[PDB]
Paper text:
The maps obtained in nanodiscs showed poor map density for the VSDs. With a subset of particles processed in C1 symmetry, the map density of the VSD in nanodiscs was improved to confirm the same overall positioning of the VSD as in detergent, but with no clear side-chain map density. The cryo-EM maps for the transporter module were at a higher resolution in some regions of the nanodisc reconstruction, with a local resolution of up to 2.5 Å in most regions. In the nanodisc structure, cryo-EM map density at a local resolution of 2.5 Å supported the modelling of two phosphatidic acid (PA) lipids at the dimerization interface. The presence of PA lipids probably stabilized a more compacted SLC9C1 homodimer in the nanodisc structure, which was evident by the repositioning of helices at the dimerization interface. However, in the presence of PA, His73 interacts with the lipid, and the TM2′–TM3′ extracellular region has rearranged to coordinate the PA headgroup through water-bridged His132 and Asp129. The lipid-induced rearrangement observed in SLC9C1 is centred around an extracellular helical motif (ECH1) that is not present in the NHE119, NHE335 and NHE918 structures. In DDM/CHS, the SLC9C1 protein migrated as both a dimer and monomer. The purified SLC9C1 protein was further heated at 45 °C for 10 min in the presence of PA, PC, PS or PE lipid, yet only the addition of PA improved the resistance of SLC9C1 to heat denaturation.
SLC9C1 belongs to the NHE family of ion transporters, which facilitate the electroneutral exchange of cations (Na+/Li+/K+) and protons (H+) across membranes to regulate intracellular pH, sodium levels and cell volume. Rather than containing a partially disordered cytoplasmic tail, it contains four additional TM helices that form an S1–S4 voltage-sensing domain (VSD), and a distal cyclic-nucleotide-binding domain (CNBD)2,4. The S4 VSD renders SLC9C1 a transporter that is activated only in response to hyperpolarization (−95 mV), and the CNBD bind cAMP to enable SLC9C1 to become activated closer to the resting membrane potential of sperm (−50 mV)2 VSDs are thought to have evolved independently from ion channels, and there are a few examples of non-channel VSD domains coupled to soluble enzymes. SLC9C1 is therefore an essential component of the pH–sAC–cAMP signalling pathway in metazoa, required for sperm motility and fertilization.
Residue numbers in the entry:
A (entry chain B): 297 to 395
B (entry chain A): 68 to 538, 573 to 704, 723 to 1012, 1030 to 1190
C (entry chain B): 494 to 538, 573 to 641
D (entry chain B): 68 to 99
The structure:
Amino acid sequence: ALVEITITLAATYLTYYIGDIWLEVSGVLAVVVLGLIVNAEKTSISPEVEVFLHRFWEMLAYLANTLIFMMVGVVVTQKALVAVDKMDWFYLIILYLAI
Amino acid sequence: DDLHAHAPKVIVFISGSCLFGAISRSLFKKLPIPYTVVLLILGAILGVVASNVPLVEEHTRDVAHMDPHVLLQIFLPVLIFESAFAMDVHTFMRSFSQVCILALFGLVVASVLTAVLAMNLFNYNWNFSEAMMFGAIMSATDPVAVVALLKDLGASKQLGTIIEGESLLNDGCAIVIFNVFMKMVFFPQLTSTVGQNVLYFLQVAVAGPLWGYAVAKVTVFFLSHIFNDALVEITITLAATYLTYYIGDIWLEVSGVLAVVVLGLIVNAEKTSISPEVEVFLHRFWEMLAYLANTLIFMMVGVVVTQKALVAVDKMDWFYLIILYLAITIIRGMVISLFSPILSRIGYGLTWRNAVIMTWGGLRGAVGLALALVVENLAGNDVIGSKFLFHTAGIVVLTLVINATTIQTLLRILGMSDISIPKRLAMAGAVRRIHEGQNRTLNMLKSDRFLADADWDIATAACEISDPYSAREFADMMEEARLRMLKAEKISYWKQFEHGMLAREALRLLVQHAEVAADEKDQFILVDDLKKSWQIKGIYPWLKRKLEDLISEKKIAAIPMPKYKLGKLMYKICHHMAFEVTINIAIVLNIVPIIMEFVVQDKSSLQKIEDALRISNYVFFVIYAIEAIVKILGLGRHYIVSHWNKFDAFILVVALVDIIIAETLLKGSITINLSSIKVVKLFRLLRGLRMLRLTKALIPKLILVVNGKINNQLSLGYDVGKGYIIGEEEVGKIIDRMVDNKKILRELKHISETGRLQVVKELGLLQREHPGIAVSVKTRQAIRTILNHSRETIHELQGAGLLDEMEAHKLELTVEIKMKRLMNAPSSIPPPPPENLLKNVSWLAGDMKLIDFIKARASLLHFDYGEVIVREGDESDGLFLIVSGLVKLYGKSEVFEDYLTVGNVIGEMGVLTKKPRNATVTCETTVQVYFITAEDMNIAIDTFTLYPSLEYRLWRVVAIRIATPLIMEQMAFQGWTQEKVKLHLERGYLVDLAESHFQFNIDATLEDVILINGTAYNAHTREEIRSPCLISRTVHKLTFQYTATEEPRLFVVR
Amino acid sequence: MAGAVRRIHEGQNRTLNMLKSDRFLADADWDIATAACEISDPYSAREFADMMEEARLRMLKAEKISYWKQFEHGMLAREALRLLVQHAEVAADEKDQFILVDDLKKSWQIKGIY
Amino acid sequence: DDLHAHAPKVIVFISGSCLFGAISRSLFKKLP
Ligand SMILES: CCCCCCCCCCCCCCCCCC(=O)OC[C@H](COP(=O)(O)O)OC(=O)CCCCCCCCCCCCCCCCC
Ligand SMILES: CCCCCCCCCCCCCCCCCC(=O)OC[C@H](COP(=O)(O)O)OC(=O)CCCCCCCCCCCCCCCCC
């Protein structure tokens, strides 16, 4: 099981890194295709291994989301709120309606 | 990217390390060589390649040159916590002293000897500190392969546990000593005063475990209150581990490794708080993290060594490496042999073969490599940089190549890998049964029509499942009978455990007792003289602590309600919990002012600080005075009645005196005399005593925890006893089937019955001693059983297809949440009053009119020791309900003897059949009984004749009581557990004999029918039958006739 | 859901009676009758044509149960089960037409032509 | 540590973020 999980992790990260830096190519699309293909042919993985993998990836995504959300607040409060006018809130409302 | 853009290149290195580790693991699965050696070789090759090609250098520069702090803080906690988590905590604690002594003393002696050897033999001019660091690095072990082998061969589980615990403690202590001497060497700090050194040692050696214990308690408490959240639990575990290590090591300098070890052990022990699936996931998660860390370290060390250490090396370094390997191998064995007497005469002891296996299993691991890398990075001189890493890597490689490869051969030579003959026979039987089943399924498949063209070569590819392993008479008969009893007990215990009633610790205890009895010659398992006493005992100053806590808590039972003024309002305010909350809040607020004042004394900011402190002190004094006014008033002298309030009054008086003295200090009093004017500490230090006023609340909570622990102990003991009882019963029936030789069945049955009766009496007395915890234990068992059966019903409904997955998952989640909430329940419960006990009796339970007829009737009787409630042969004239106490029944029914306790009835059969008493019952303790007269019982039965008549319910209870032994005897190894038979009999019903001559067809649906008390006949033979007896399938048809002397009562099922 | 909750309640009552009949567990507090995890049910809260509709729905349910049992035994797979359930539901939605017309709805999979 | 010793301070931030996320998830389970 350890070998399978490590293979999945290394494959994902190597795919993204190599595709984006060397032989410049859309890394995000490659990772999307790789994930979809692995999801389709998931019978190769053992049952318990896939059961573990689902929760593992869910937890990793949760960690990433939490980190990004925590960081954005600090950065905004330290930099963006310094520069703002009375019309920016009006523009924000208009933009919300427009989108 | 352009200009100065740093694309993280560590990602490529880490991913490549993982890929190489996977390849090495897959390729060398069969070869004895560990894959870590291959990893080291690959790392060395990569380093040599990178030393020439500039491009590869950039991708192996920031990972092969990590700052030591990052390396430690990122990798050590993972390894330590994984090692602590994986271990079996209970077996480790059962022999804690042995492991502690071994680890600590052996590590110290080995490090000292290795340091002296390095100082003398080696030509390097090293001082004692460097040699001690060297020895500490070289004295750390990591026995994974040996533990795995010992586990898989299934020999000496205690040996594997001992090895694991010793390795863990060795790693912790080695890290501690290495940190101490590294600080001594690379960061000299002036002199070393005796007091400063003593304080430093006390801190590093005590504050660590305490900090870890506190963190573990808090984290476990928080985890116990999480329902339906796996991500939260996993994140909490990770954050707790890393925060513990980081905070303990950096802020409030303390041994982080020890704290993490303690936290991991504590979390492992109390892992019932975590949900099942969550813990199953956590095990694999931590295992994978540890594997990743090991792979990364092993890959890094090879590159670093090939790039730095191999540059500086002479022809004598290899000779020194060989000598050092020999010396450490000799030293480990010498230490183990020397400490053998102490840990053998006491503790568990050791055998010479076990000592040899332990000596040869000391494989160095990754902790030594990490410490060597830290040392190498901390210096720029060869005399300590190259030599340390070179020797460490050489020793690691030599150990892995030689000891790991030859451990299996060493095990074989000692003859510790043999296979027990019974295990081989069981495996052969299982394989034969599997083959028979496969052949039957193959025939069924062949008979099919849609599958006839399928190639039948699959008979070879059908997964044969080839069996592994390749390949005066009285004394022997008694040995065989003893072994048969052992096997029967093991099967009964294992069935009970699988059904979810035997628990885990109880099962281990029973299996160990059975195995020890088997090892001994001519002695039945479970002597019960003392081997079943301590668990039931639960005696230790913890009970003394409980008594002291109970005695300390004292207060006035009641206080008069004065009519002057408002009255009730003031008393309610004073006695309301709001008063206690306000007192606690005031104490907490004043605690901060005391700390601030102490810090200020020890050390316009000063003016503001002084003004704030004075204002806070005045506010706290005013609040305390108001709280005192709330009391005293109305209570009057009662306020001084409780000695506890004296401390509060003294604290308030002292605070007021200090405040008054500090406010003006001009009126007079002391003034010139030595006072707060010259030394104001007495005016502030005593303020800390106010915190002691909160101890009143601490006493109750503490009691709680103590009770908790007591409960647990008692709980376990209780359960174990029950197990044994049940087991004996099963073996009873089993003992009837086999042996077949007279004068032996007595040999087994006498011991079995004696042990059963002794355990029953012990359990009854133990319950009588502690009326509270028993109620909680019984309630918990009832809830667990009900929830288990509800979950089984939900599973059956889902399987039948009548419930979709959404509803099934909802119900399962509800059940799981309720079970988890149950796992956290009060330790003790108040025993119910007798009235509810009478109201809860099963047979009369239901209609409230019957309960009224009973409660308005009946009577309560008190008895003392040796009082004979009933005389043998005395006419049945009333019932009995044990509302408290314990009684012993003796008589002939085989002179059967038994014990009864609270919530049991006695004379049902006499009232239902008007027969003389069965056995004489005598009180073994002051007892209380409910005596319902026979005449009143007959009046009640006559009055109530609804469809579920009282007489019908009583007869149903009696019939179900009688039937169970017969059905159990029917179990001639078939397997019924003596409980599933109860459920099977529950669905039954009494015979509704409207006409005397019913012919109940004996169809396959009815299963079995029992003759409770009556005469039944066959359709053809009409053979006379007298109850009690089982009709048996021989009597094909069951006719009937109207008997006269005895009214015929039959129990039937369908 | 109501039927399942009633069945669970009946099973719990039977188990409670069995436990009460026991001897080693008589002092245990029976307040559990309330704390026994009641499992409260969620959600709070011309004749020929109708008879034919009822018969069609009964056939739908029988087919669903058969497919579910076969899949649980490990023979119906998942994609096949999804196809069968979708066909049953679509037939139920339509009026006066048995599931699995088989005219074309059971052809492409057998076809395998491209 | 002394002189130029970089104790990784990222660990504290990441662990605190995880703790705050857990607290927020637990507290607002019912709130929309
Ligand atoms: C192998 C696992 C799957 C594939 C990889 C997963 C993701 C890998 C990245 C993990 C987070 C670390 C990012 C690297 C740090 C950013 C800065 C940097 O690299 O520049 C050098 C960075 C910048 O500072 P300077 O070079 O001193 O100027 O160098 C340092 O001082 C710090 C050294 C960074 C590398 C430390 C070793 C890696 C730590 C994590 C252990 C391995 C991952 C554990 C498993 C994770 C998944 C479960
Ligand atoms: C929350 C999870 C459990 C607790 C924490 C787990 C372990 C945390 C450390 C993970 C590896 C990163 C170590 C830090 C990098 C070393 C250098 C450094 O910090 O100095 C600043 C480092 C040194 O270079 P300078 O500051 O530019 O001179 O700064 C950088 O340029 C790189 C920025 C490093 C921080 C990147 C953010 C963290 C990346 C990983 C994402 C979070 C963890 C994912 C989950 C892992 C567990 C499953």
